[PDB]
């Protein structure tokens with residue numbers, strides 16, 4: 001199993017990537033995992049640089065579309081961001097036995113994004129557990145964009161005593177404020193010019209919050225209401241760990257909305273008072 | 274600093290973090306870490322787990338002692354006597370600082386056999402095994418075949434989650450009459466202790482009847498059990514060695530469970546069919 005440094009090395013077999021990761025961590029190099037699903041956009045690249053600026057770092061980026069909850073291009077971007085290792089497993093190699101032992105998330109997984117799709121987080125956490133066992137990284141990187149996934153991953157790491165640091169990375173935005181997503185490729189300049197409502201409603205809510213939680217929401221609800229063809233799935237104010245109603249201190253505002261069949265998510269830091 | 278470690282003696286910690294800092298560090302120096310999960314109240318059975326762990330070139334042995342909700346110096350003195358250098362004895366609160374939250378969900382095998390009476394028992398069992406694995410990160414981890422279904426599910430945990438550890442299954446330690454040692458044996462009256470032999474007697478009969486095939490081995494075992502008073506059989510089942518469907522020839526496993534008074538006893542044995 002061969003690792004050519006300063007270059008992009010691509011492994012498919014769990015065993016190879018594991019052996020190398022292990023070899024490397026002996027050499028005093030610190031392994032950083034960036035789990036992806038392919039289709040890398042400027043927003044994944046934030047995740048890569050964050051990892052990259054860790055002194056000693058060897059970066060592993062995994063590209064795996066999990067069938068339960070652009071290979072070349074992604075690789076080019078990677079060779080170009082200076083990434084040394086890409087882990088691209090097959091489905092057979094990740095599920096030789098199908099769904100057998102799986103992770104069951106806590107009750108947070110049935111809410112929000114888990115409300116319509118109630119096994120999605122089980123799917124997600126199960127693969128993240130396998131990735132972190134395969135690669136045993138020092139730190140593992142996730143975008144704040146999918147903030148509920150982030151919190152759930154931290155519970156995973158805590159509840160199972162996993163020896164890995166979870167770094168959440170702040171969302172990356174187009175110049176008008178729209179959260180970068182693959183999904184924004186879909187969207188007529190109709191829908192896509194309306195798409196800016198999500199972040200505008202969030203940033204307004206965040207400013208209005210001096211007047212309280214209640215003003216912050218009305219603000220945001222007012223902004224979406226004034227947007228052509230944005231159908232809200234949810235708009236929700238939570239504590240940073242995604243419990244209740246942030247007392248009145250500080251927390252998170254979350255939004256999910258359809259434009260056509262294209263579902264968008266976004267969230268922001270909020271302080272009340 | 275790494276916490277305080279004194280070679281050749283019993284070092285105790287109950288801080289998950291302390292035993293993880295120490296485990297890591299010994300490893301970096303060329304000791305191979307062995308873990309023995311126990312629930313306290315040790316006896317020979319546990320002790321042969323401990324000896325198999327010791328007999329690895331360069332081993333440091335780690336015995337955890339913790340009692341598993343969703344499934345004393347007596348004990349440590351046994352460990353000292355056995356030359357074990359690390360005991361791990363965390364509190365319920367240290368293992369579960371946020372309550373039951375994220376847990377392991379087993380394959381369908383967790384529903385069968387022992388998971389008939391206790392449909393959520395193994396979820397509890399695997400969730401804490403995972404945890405200990407992650408805290409201690411041993412090279413090898415040790416279980417008795419006594420609890421064979423347990424041991425097959427731990428193997429499935431290890432394969433499905435891509436865990437770094439070799440699972441070693443340790444041959445059942447028996448009384449002189451062949452009764453599998455278990456803390457529960459202290460409870461059987463003399464009549465029961467006596468009828469209690471029937472379990473192993475049927476399994477070994479089965480194992481030798483087996484050169485005539487599967488139905489022979491099962492009928493042999495059933496006869497031995499029918500010749501016992503006060504032994505209510507929960508199941509008697511033969512399976513392949515990973516616990517799938519009754520095999521047609523070659524390796525396999527025979528499991529039994531039975532109530533004597535209020536005591537529930539278990540036992541299983543390897544089978545070669547024909």
Ligand SMILES: Nc1ncnc2c1ncn2[C@@H]1O[C@H](CSSCc2ccccc2)[C@@H](O)[C@H]1O
Pocket residue numbers: 035036037043044046047064124125127128141142143144145146169170171172173179180181
């Ligand atoms: N605009 C954006 N800004 C920041 N991060 C972004 C982003 N868009 C996407 N991401 C970040 O991309 C990451 C990877 S894709 S889903 C994570 C995963 C991968 C494999 C198995 C299970 C779970 C996410 O952590 C997301 O938050």
Ligand SMILES: Nc1ncnc2c1ncn2[C@@H]1O[C@H](CSSCc2ccccc2)[C@@H](O)[C@H]1O
Pocket residue numbers: 310311312317318319322341398399401402415416417418419420443444445446447453454455
């Ligand atoms: N007579 C006997 N012979 C051999 N092993 C025996 C035994 N009696 C018990 N054992 C073996 O003694 C070990 C200790 S019992 S606790 C198992 C556990 C610990 C922590 C979390 C989940 C589950 C077991 O591996 C059992 O099979």
